[PDB]
Each structure stands twice: as C-alpha cells, then as structure tokens.
Design a binder for this molecule. Structure first.
Ligand SMILES: NC(=O)c1ccc[n+]([C@@H]2O[C@H](COP(=O)([O-])OP(=O)(O)OC[C@H]3O[C@@H](n4cnc5c(N)ncnc54)[C@H](OP(=O)(O)O)[C@@H]3O)[C@@H](O)[C@H]2O)c1
Length: 170
C-alpha cells in the first residue's frame, strides 16, 4: 500500500482576459483557435475535470480521446460519455491512481477548490477586455511562481495579443 503518497498529478488550465473574465452565459466570450488547439494538446489522452455549469455551457458534449469527469452534488446527474463525481475527495482519489494527468478545466468554483491540490497552472492571458459574468477566482498566488511564458502568434484567425504562461509551486 501507498496510502501515504499522492502519485497522480493535477494541472489547472484556462484562458482569461485582462479583467480575469473566463466565461459568459456558460460559454467563452472570445474565439481564439490557437488556444483551443493548445488546450487539446494538454488534455488529449488525459482526464479533464469540469464543474457542472461549465460542462452544460459546452452543450453537455465530451471531447473525444480523453476521459471527462463532471463534478456535481446531484446524485442522479447523468450525461453522455462522462464520469460523474460528487466531491473534491472523489476527484482526488481518482487522480491519485490515474496513470496520466488530471486536468482541472474549470469553472470558477472548481478552480478555487482544486487549485490548492494542483502542481502546475497553464494560463493563456488574453490582452483584451470582453463582457462576461464569470471570473477566475481569488487564489493564493504566494505559493506559485511563473516558470515560463511565450507570446502567441496573431493572424486572421487569432485576433488578440496573448501569452501562454506556466506556473509551478515555490
Ligand atoms: N451575476 C451572476 O449571477 C453571476 C456571477 C458568477 C457566475 N454566474 C454563473 O455561474 C455559472 C458558472 O460559474 P462557475 O465557473 O463557478 O461554474 P462551475 O465551476 O463550472 O460549476 C459549478 C458547479 O459544479 C459543482 N461542484 C463544484 N464543486 C463541487 C464539489 N466539491 N462537490 C460537488 N459538486 C461540486 C456544482 O454542481 P451542482 O450545482 O449540480 O451541485 C456547481 O454548482 C454560469 O452559468 C454563470 O452564468 C453568474
């Protein structure tokens, strides 16, 4: 037994604007194709954890070739093609014994609860302001430091200046 070790890994990944906006009416308030492609690279063949509201904002659809977990207090919640779990503890138990990375995909409640258990943050900082109703939550930034940053390429498909940032624990 290895009940005294945590042998999995949690990454939180998200895109936000310069106000900290991450969503509006369930959906993304911007379109930035390169970031979606980066996101798929990080989640492909891994596990993606989503709070119920975010999941439903995506039209209740799972991304292929990943395992998605939907978090909800509702014991009877079922959706198509996803695991459903009902507590942080339950998420952590799955993550401990999962062979790949358990990616925390949001939304705000999920980030605030699970970021304390994460080992890395992948943030896409979009340098523009949009209208939204959901913000990245207040977290303890004192335990994190930025270890990498790369500017994103703008083109006819990607309209906004943006940075891809990586944070690790100090
Ligand atoms: N002006 C305002 O009214 C305003 C301000 C902020 C956001 N909102 C809105 O709220 C939504 C999304 O915000 P969000 O990013 O915080 O949503 P989210 O994190 O994606 O999902 C939140 C939900 O996941 C659940 N969950 C999270 N932790 C859990 C736990 N430890 N155990 C069991 N279930 C857990 C709940 O499902 P269950 O509820 O089924 O238990 C919960 O309500 C949007 O639809 C949006 O419009 C509006």
């Amino acid at each position: 037994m290895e009940n005294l070790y945590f042998q999995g890994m949690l990454a939180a990944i998200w895109a936000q604007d310069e106000q900290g906006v991450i969503g509006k009416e369930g959906k993304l308030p911007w379109h930035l194709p390169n970031d979606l492609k980066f996101f798929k690279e990080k989640t492909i063949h891994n596990t993606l954890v989503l709070g119920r509201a975010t999941f439903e904002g995506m039209g209740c659809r799972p991304l292929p070739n990943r395992t998605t977990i939907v978090l909800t207090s509702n014991p009877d919640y079922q959706a198509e093609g996803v695991l459903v779990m009902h507590s942080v503890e339950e998420i952590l138990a799955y993550a401990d014994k999962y062979e790949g990375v358990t990616v925390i995909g949001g939304g705000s409640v999920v980030f605030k609860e699970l970021i304390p258990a994460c080992d890395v943050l992948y943030r896409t900082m979009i340098h523009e302001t949009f209208e939204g109703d959901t913000f990245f939550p207040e977290i303890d930034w004192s335990v994190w430091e930025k270890v990498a940053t790369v500017p994103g390429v703008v083109d006819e498909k990607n309209l906004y200046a943006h940075d891809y940032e990586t944070y690790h624990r100090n």
